[PDB]
Amino acid sequence: FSLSCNNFNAVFSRISTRLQELTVCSEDNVDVHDIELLQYINVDCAKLKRLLKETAFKFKALKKVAQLAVINSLEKAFWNWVENYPDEFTKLYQIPQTDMAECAEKLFDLVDGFAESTKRKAAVWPLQIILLILCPEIIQDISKDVVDENNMNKKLFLDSLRKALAGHGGSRQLTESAAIACVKLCKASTYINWEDNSVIFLLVQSMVVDLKNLLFNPSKPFSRGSQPADVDLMIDCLVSCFRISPHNNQHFKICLAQNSPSTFHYVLVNSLHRIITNSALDWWPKIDAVYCHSVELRNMFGETLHKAVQGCGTDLETRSYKYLLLSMVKLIHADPKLLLCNPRKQGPETQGSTAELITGLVQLVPQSHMPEIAQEAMEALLVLHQLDSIDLWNPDAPVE
């Protein structure tokens, strides 16, 4: 990635050769590793246009295996640009650019032709949305009357997505795919300032309500594959949704509720963990909004701690707690003010809240049952000693 910053052509030339070799040859080969270098090369807006144009010309003649690799690799290329160059993404919707729109549309059609079977549709759907996002006005027309051919194929795809997203269709594979695709759309929306207030915001609103019921139904655990639930997927959704509507989130409570399964707890804390550590855009909401829930967070710490220690002195249920406990400890390490807000203050007959927190952390240091946790609790307790964090223990009297 660092090398690609300057000498882009050198890397870029090597890829172009492999495509031509595969293009002319007719005996399918599996040495696509040259193709898969797109995932790492630094990309800028102008450079990205080049990638689409070159692949577009050569895509149709490629073999089946080659076609998949370029699609995935090209998909991950999109995110590299967005993160590394946030500003350029805003300007795309701020001011129209036909050239960007034109290249995506041609590529859009080629992919759609490529995918016919349900298995194919599952693979390619995540990409197609990204391209559709790239051409803004085609969305507007899709909402209104549809052109004979210009916006005909697009509108058919967009509504086809929703059916599986709502579970109407009797296809599990597409149901899983629709989730991934929608999430990326939700994630991408976050970057748009919303001052444009384009259809992008409106389009997401249509799918958000359906999406949440699919991923955040305690009765039914969404299980993509071997794992009981796609923990990684849920984190992406919740983090994004927060940024869109931070004022009063309604599903924070669903996870934060004690009755919900642990995984909902696990997803919650990690979700708060990204908020603290990765906030590039200033106009995003910040962790301060969540301080109001501190009281409920602490109770979760207490109960998890109580059961975690007891087990060490079912099979996976016990193991689950330890993982949750480790995550909670790391959270305090990241930010101590999150859990210290709204202090209870020492009761005449009962201990306070800052005290009960420390005592729980201390009884883990000498454990040696859970060496990883013990190591962490040391760092956590060492951060609550910085001069800055001493004040929060009891703001009434910090030196008693």
Side-chain angles (χ1 to χ4, degrees), residues 104-334:
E105 293 169 18
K106 180 169 66 179
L107 184 56
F108 186 106
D109 307 333
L110 297 176
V111 181
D112 194 332
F114 160 75
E116 300 161 327
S117 302
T118 62
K119 169 263 186 175
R120 288 195 176 183
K121 290 179 179 180
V124 307
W125 279 11
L127 168 52
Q128 293 191 343
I129 281 184
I130 275 54
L131 303 170
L132 181 61
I133 295 165
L134 290 176
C135 47
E137 293 188 3
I138 289 183
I139 304 173
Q140 297 181 6
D141 310 343
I142 284 164
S143 305
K144 300 168 184 177
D145 59 342
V146 170
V147 179
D148 297 354
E149 305 180 10
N150 305 21
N151 312 333
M152 168 52 189
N153 209 336
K154 288 70 168 179
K155 203 248 178 55
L156 166 57
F157 153 79
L158 177 53
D159 290 3
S160 173
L161 185 67
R162 279 162 172 166
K163 300 177 186 176
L165 184 65
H168 291 354
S171 57
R172 236 294 180 174
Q173 289 184 340
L174 273 64
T175 305
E176 299 175 352
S177 175
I180 311 309
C182 183
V183 167
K184 303 194 177 184
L185 171 54
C186 293
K187 181 179 176 180
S189 165
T190 55
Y191 291 92
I192 303 172
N193 296 27
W194 185 84
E195 297 190 6
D196 311 60
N197 195 331
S198 304
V199 296
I200 303 301
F201 176 90
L202 305 177
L203 176 55
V204 172
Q205 289 292 345
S206 311
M207 306 177 179
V208 65
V209 298
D210 189 342
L211 178 61
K212 301 208 175 193
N213 293 26
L214 176 50
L215 293 174
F216 286 97
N217 176 267
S219 62
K220 183 62 177 62
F222 171 80
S223 186
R224 190 187 68 171
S226 59
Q227 302 179 10
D230 179 351
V231 176
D232 189 357
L233 180 65
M234 301 171 60
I235 291 169
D236 297 4
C237 174
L238 186 57
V239 175
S240 307
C241 303
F242 171 93
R243 285 158 175 171
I244 292 168
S245 57
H247 300 291
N248 285 19
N249 183 310
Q250 293 185 13
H251 292 252
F252 257 49
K253 300 182 177 182
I254 293 173
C255 291
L256 192 50
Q258 283 293 131
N259 306 345
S260 47
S262 56
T263 55
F264 286 66
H265 299 108
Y266 183 101
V267 167
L268 175 52
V269 298
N270 299 24
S271 165
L272 300 167
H273 202 279
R274 285 194 190 176
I275 297 169
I276 303 180
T277 188
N278 297 337
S279 297
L281 278 56
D282 299 357
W283 67 270
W284 283 347
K286 300 301 187 186
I287 183 63
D288 312 14
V290 198
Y291 290 164
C292 56
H293 293 271
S294 67
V295 177
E296 297 185 6
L297 286 170
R298 303 187 307 207
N299 291 326
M300 177 166 53
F301 182 94
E303 297 185 5
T304 304
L305 170 54
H306 176 86
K307 284 178 288 184
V309 164
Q310 185 176 22
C312 71
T314 68
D315 180 13
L316 288 174
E317 181 173 352
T318 294
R319 182 182 304 175
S320 179
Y321 289 101
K322 305 219 302 181
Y323 283 135
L324 170 55
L325 182 52
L326 177 53
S327 298
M328 295 212 66
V329 173
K330 294 190 181 177
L331 180 53
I332 309 185
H333 176 15

